[PDB]
Structure 1
Amino acid sequence: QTMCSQYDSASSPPYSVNQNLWGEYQGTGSQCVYVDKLSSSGASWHTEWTWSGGEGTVKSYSNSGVTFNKKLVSDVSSIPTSVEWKQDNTNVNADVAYDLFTAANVDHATSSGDYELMIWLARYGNIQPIGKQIATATVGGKSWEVWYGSTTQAGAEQRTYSFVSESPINSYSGDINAFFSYLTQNQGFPASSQYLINLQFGTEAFTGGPATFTVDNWTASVN
């Protein structure tokens, strides 16, 4: 499947590959997502993009996602995931990251939440997470810079926690629940009153290109 319009999705329950150019009007360029292999066991895809203008603003977040029974973070047993990706052309402003949202209302829209947990496997150019660094933590046998900041739009505030690796991690696997556990015990995260409502992985593109982001394989589950 080749997807080049603003919003498109291809799915094979529980996996999906999504073209999402939500910040398209902030600049000039083009981007398509190509499904390489999509089945109930995992997703393989790539995206080629070129964006100019609106420096510092995200133009898109093409990604692969997984559907699951939404539940309280405190009730989550494990969130196993694995991925292998590659970036062709690093002279760009972009990041490679997992994006998870939680909300006090299980019926909350999945495009945002009360809290957002981001796990950056790579950072390119001059971009940086929202807020400021508040710690460095060891999660899953790896060291991460812990960033925290908030944003407000249309009357709703979103608190974002970002775990950033020092250098690119192209092959990664682990239990994402370990990050929630850290937040619950070390940053007062309200795990017993927040529902996990979305889990995605992809690349946020700001400016630069032509560039190609490739996901050789991606798996994820919420138990």
Structure 2
Amino acid sequence: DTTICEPFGTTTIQGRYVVQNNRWGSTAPQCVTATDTGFRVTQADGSAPTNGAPKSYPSVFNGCHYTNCSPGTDLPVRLDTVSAAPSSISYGFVDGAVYNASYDIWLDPTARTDGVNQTEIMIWFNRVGPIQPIGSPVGTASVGGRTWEVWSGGNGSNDVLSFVAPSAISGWSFDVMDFVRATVARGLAENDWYLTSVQAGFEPWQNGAGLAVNSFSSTVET
């Protein structure tokens, strides 16, 4: 295991994914501990107002996030060359934090390895507390066999389309291209765009220690 408390510290797991503390929105201590198959939040002090941004987005990812590219990633990859982009996750939840458990999937018109990507897809697997996605609710959508409430809006530097689960999903295996297709269908990407990263972790607003990504996988079939 590797513990990271530096706000912008990262490490690699399984020779392929990057674990990032990513404590961009808080000044109180936060640490993650990378394990063989994922990571756990081992400290997450402080509270951010629930009507604003979260404290951070501790997470694990395949792909390129602001110059940081996981070892041997196939991303960024052009979407029309992808037959499938399967991803799986096992989340560990705890009862005394205000947070969401979410994937952040980034798409762009260029093979972006750095800088803000054009469109962000968010998949909320769990939500505890009076928090809500960026933008406003636009109705439901069936993606991957499950029903989601969809939100769309612009978070500042870019567009964000969120798919929110009705109740907690602690583990799932799915094709990231299903959500990409739903995004293309809403006019926020095109088929010849690039998938630049697939990330999963938590956005905590209050506490967060104990939350974990027990396992994660993300590949691309071309």
* TM-score bracket for this pair, using the shorter chain length: 0.7 to 0.9
Q: Tell me which residue corresponds to 1:58.
A: 54
Question: Does the CA contact (< 8 Å) of 1:74 and 1:191 recur in 2?
Answer: no
Q: TM-score, normalised by structure 2?
A: 0.86
Q: How many angstroms apart in 1 are the aligned matches of 2:39 and 2:77?
A: 28
Q: How many angstroms apart in 1 are the aligned matches of 2:130 and 2:75?
A: 37
Aligned-residue offset at 1:23: 1.1
| 1:7 aligns to 2:5 (yes or no) | no
| 1:116 aligns to 2:120 (yes or no) | yes
| 1:35 aligns to 2:34 (yes or no) | yes
Spell out, residue by residue over 1:42-80, the C-alpha distance to the aligned partner (whole angstroms, 9 max, x if none): x22211322224442221111111132312223322111
Q: Match of 1:197, as an amino acid?
A: T
| 1:134 aligns to 2:135 (yes or no) | no
From 90, 93, 98, give the equivalent of 2:98: 93
Aligned-residue offset at 1:6: 0.7
Aligned residues: 207
Question: Does the CA contact (< 8 Å) of 1:8 and 1:20 recur in 2?
Answer: yes
Q: Secondary structure of the equivalent of 2:102?
A: strand
| 1:215 aligns to 2:219 (yes or no) | no
Q: Secondary structure of the equivalent of 1:60?
A: coil
Mark the CA change 1:70 to 1:19 in structure 2 (over 3 Å): closer, same or farther: same
Q: Secondary structure of the equivalent of 2:214?
A: strand
Q: Which has the higher strand share?
A: 1
Mark the CA change 1:35 to 1:151 in structure 2 (over 3 Å): closer, same or farther: closer
Aligned-residue offset at 1:128: 0.4
From 22, 31, 44, give the equivalent of 1:20: 22
Aligned-residue offset at 1:139: 1.1
Q: How many angstroms apart in 1 are the aligned matches of 2:90 and 2:112?
A: 32
Q: Secondary structure of the equivalent of 1:178?
A: helix
5+ residue gaps, structure 1, are 38-42
Spell out, residue by residue over 1:114-162, the C-alpha distance to the aligned partner (whole angstroms, 9 max, x if none): 1001111011101100111112111111001111001334xxxx11000
Q: How many angstroms apart in 2 are the aligned matches of 1:217 and 1:175?
A: 16
Instruction: Provide the aligned C-alpha RMSD in A.
Output: 1.8
Matches within 5 A, 1:173-184: 173-184=173-184
Q: Tell me which residue corresponds to 1:40.
A: none
Question: Does the CA contact (< 8 Å) of 1:129 and 1:162 recur in 2?
Answer: yes
From 106, 124, 149, give the equivalent of 1:145: 149
Spell out, residue by residue over 1:195-216, the C-alpha distance to the aligned partner (whole angstroms, 9 max, x if none): 111111100111x226311222
Question: Does the CA contact (< 8 Å) of 2:150 and 2:161 recur in 1?
Answer: yes
Aligned-residue offset at 1:108: 5.2
Q: TM-score, normalised by structure 1?
A: 0.85
Q: How many angstroms apart in 2 are the aligned matches of 1:187 and 1:86?
A: 32
